[PDB]
Amino acid sequence: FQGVIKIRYPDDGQWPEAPIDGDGDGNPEFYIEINPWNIQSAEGYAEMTYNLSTGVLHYVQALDDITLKNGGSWVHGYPEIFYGNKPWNNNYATDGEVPLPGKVSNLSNFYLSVSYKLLPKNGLPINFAIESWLTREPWRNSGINSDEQELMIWLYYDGLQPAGSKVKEIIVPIVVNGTPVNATFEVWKANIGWEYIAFRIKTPIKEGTVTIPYGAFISAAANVTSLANYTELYLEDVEVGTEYGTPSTTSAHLEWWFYNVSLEYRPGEPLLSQPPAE
Amino acid sequence: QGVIKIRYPDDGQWPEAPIDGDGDGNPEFYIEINPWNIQSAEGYAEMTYNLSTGVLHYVQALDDITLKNGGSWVHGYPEIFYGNKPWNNNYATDGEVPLPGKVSNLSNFYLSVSYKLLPKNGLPINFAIESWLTREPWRNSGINSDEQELMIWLYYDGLQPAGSKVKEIIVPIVVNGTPVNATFEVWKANIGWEYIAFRIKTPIKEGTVTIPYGAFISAAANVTSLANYTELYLEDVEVGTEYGTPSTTSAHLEWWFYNVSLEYRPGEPLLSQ
Numbered sequence: 004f005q006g007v008i009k010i011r012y013p014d015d016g017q018w019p020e021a022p023i024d025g026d027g028d029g030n031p032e033f034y035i036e037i038n039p040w041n042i043q044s045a046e047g048y049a050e051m052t053y054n055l056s057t058g059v060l061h062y063v064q065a066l067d068d069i070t071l072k073n074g075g076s077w078v079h080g081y082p083e084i085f086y087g088n089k090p091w092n093n094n095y096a097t098d099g100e101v102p103l104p105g106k107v108s109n110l111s112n113f114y115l116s117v118s119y120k121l122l123p124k125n126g127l128p129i130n131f132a133i134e135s136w137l138t139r140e141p142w143r144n145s146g147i148n149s150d151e152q153e154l155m156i157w158l159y160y161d162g163l164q165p166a167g168s169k170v171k172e173i174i175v176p177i178v179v180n181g182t183p184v185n186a187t188f189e190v191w192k193a194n195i196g197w198e199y200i201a202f203r204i205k206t207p208i209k210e211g212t213v214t215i216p217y218g219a220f221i222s223a224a225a226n227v228t229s230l231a232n233y234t235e236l237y238l239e240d241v242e243v244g245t246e247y248g249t250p251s252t253t254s255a256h257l258e259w260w261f262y263n264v265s266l267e268y269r270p271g272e273p274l275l276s277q278p279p280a281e
Numbered sequence: 282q283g284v285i286k287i288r289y290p291d292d293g294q295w296p297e298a299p300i301d302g303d304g305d306g307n308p309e310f311y312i313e314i315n316p317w318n319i320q321s322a323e324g325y326a327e328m329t330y331n332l333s334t335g336v337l338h339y340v341q342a343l344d345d346i347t348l349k350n351g352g353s354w355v356h357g358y359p360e361i362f363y364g365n366k367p368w369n370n371n372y373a374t375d376g377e378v379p380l381p382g383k384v385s386n387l388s389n390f391y392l393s394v395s396y397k398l399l400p401k402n403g404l405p406i407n408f409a410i411e412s413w414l415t416r417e418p419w420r421n422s423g424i425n426s427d428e429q430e431l432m433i434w435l436y437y438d439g440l441q442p443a444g445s446k447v448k449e450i451i452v453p454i455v456v457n458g459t460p461v462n463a464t465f466e467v468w469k470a471n472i473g474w475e476y477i478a479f480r481i482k483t484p485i486k487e488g489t490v491t492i493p494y495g496a497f498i499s500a501a502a503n504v505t506s507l508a509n510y511t512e513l514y515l516e517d518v519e520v521g522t523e524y525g526t527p528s529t530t531s532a533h534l535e536w537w538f539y540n541v542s543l544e545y546r547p548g549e550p551l552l553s554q
């Protein structure tokens with residue numbers, strides 16, 4: 004009896020995507036993409052289903068004989084669901100609590116909650132990667148420039164390493180399965196035609212419920228940035244997905260569930276605060 | 282008499298101009314001061330093209346430079362180029378070589394530059410020829426992950442290419458009329474696109490240098506991790522000087538490009554080995 008929004012690769016082409024619009028206003032609450040952005044040719048399939056009655060996002064992938072677009076780029080793809088304005092295509096989803104896009108100097112704090120269970124097969128290198136783009140303009144569709152930032156938050160990883168160098172270690176208070184815990188994150192800094200900041204947790208979480216304060220990561224990235232006028236940047240979106248694959252990986256079998264992805268806004272509390280504990 | 286002058290920071294923060302000697306509307310070349318990583322600075326930068334003599338003269342006297350992306354290392358890239366620049370709306374296609382053209386469709390061509398460099402106070406600079414290779418011919422919005430940045434360094438001082446050195450190659454070039462086998466370091470960085478930089482191991486601060494562009498395109502076709510490399514579009518040929526480091530606050534620079542010339546070779550394939 005469940006209504007389902009299903010996208011499938013390669014049946015739906017090379018960019019399978021669909022908006023999640025329960026209220027039918029034309030502005031989606033979220034946007035799902037299979038996003039195999041580095042897959043150049045592949046045998047097999049990938050499929051993502053969003054259950055409209057239960058809200059669970061399901062993704063099943065069984066790709067073989069992978070040819071990559073840029074072997075340099077390492078990762079094969081990034082199947083995801085995001086809220087906000089994705090700066091890399093024309094998709095957006097702003098029907099939500101947190102006013103994204105918005106300047107980090109004007110934005111208030113918010114908490115991201117995720118409930119998931121990951122199943123990489125045959126030791127496929129994967130991660131659970133929350134990522135955000137910070138651009139000089141609010142409604143970007145053409146990509147990222149050198150004076151802009153990519154902010155990543157890795158909640159799980161296996162056989163995968165962030166770009167650049169580990170420059171710091173911070174401690175962010177998060178909630179894992181209802182219990183609050185002081186989590187240590189590795190602060191990785193790469194410069195790849197834009198500033199790349201990745202916060203890799205030291206204890207990967209393969210399944211469960213994790214809630215994080217986003218402002219703790221925005222302030223930490225502000226604390227290590229090499230960008231001028233950081234606070235003038237527009238926080239574009241919050242993307243939640245799983246990177247996977249390496250240049251030496253020709254088969255990528257993967258399945259996971261996102262039982263919930265939600266963002267609670269905190270009006271009045273500043274998003275930019277002091278740096279987290281070291 | 283007859284001088285095209287662009288200046289910084291007077292003509293805004295993107296001082297640029299076409300070079301249209303015959304006034305037909307299509308530029309033969311395009312000049313940009315291009316201080317793309319400069320957020321704030323004091324002083325001036327001036328680029329002058331004498332249409333009568335054909336010499337390009339660049340004077341720069343910048344101080345208290347605050348970088349826009351410190352991790353991007355360099356401050357800018359004052360340049361002249363032919364073809365289609367993918368990072369803005371500028372283009373210049375009144376010339377022999379059909380740029381932008383597909384790599385598998387294009388013929389070979391030789392690039393000649395005669396120049397003299399004057400970095401002041403040990404300012405880290407290079408003499409960098411660079412080209413972009415995109416999927417669509419008329420790009421104006423940037424570069425994607427499945428595209429390439431190709432660089433050829435004829436001179437450098439205190440500057441190192443991005444990424445890491447992969448190997449060295451031999452390319453036959455002509456220096457001051459004498460043909461010579463030059464050795465280039467092949468540097469490979471993957472920074473949101475593929476970045477290939479051919480840095481000569483004997484830097485040349487002044488003189489005339491002629492290079493075969495097909496030698497570098499074919500070499501890049503050999504080290505690339507991009508699929509369907511031959512289907513990319515050779516966007517343009519950019520000739521300029523990168524300069525500066527994150528710790529560089531004062532950057533004084535002067536150079537002359539006495540000639541920038543392209544000779545097409547119809548019927549001669551661009552790709553070979």
Ligand SMILES: [Ca+2]
Pocket residue numbers: 023024025026027028029030031032098
């Ligand atoms: Ca809606």
Ligand SMILES: [Ca+2]
Pocket residue numbers: 300301302303304305306307308309375
């Ligand atoms: Ca003309």
Ligand SMILES: [Cl-]
Pocket residue numbers: 015016017018
């Ligand atoms: Cl398609």
Ligand SMILES: [Cl-]
Pocket residue numbers: 104105106109
């Ligand atoms: Cl705003």
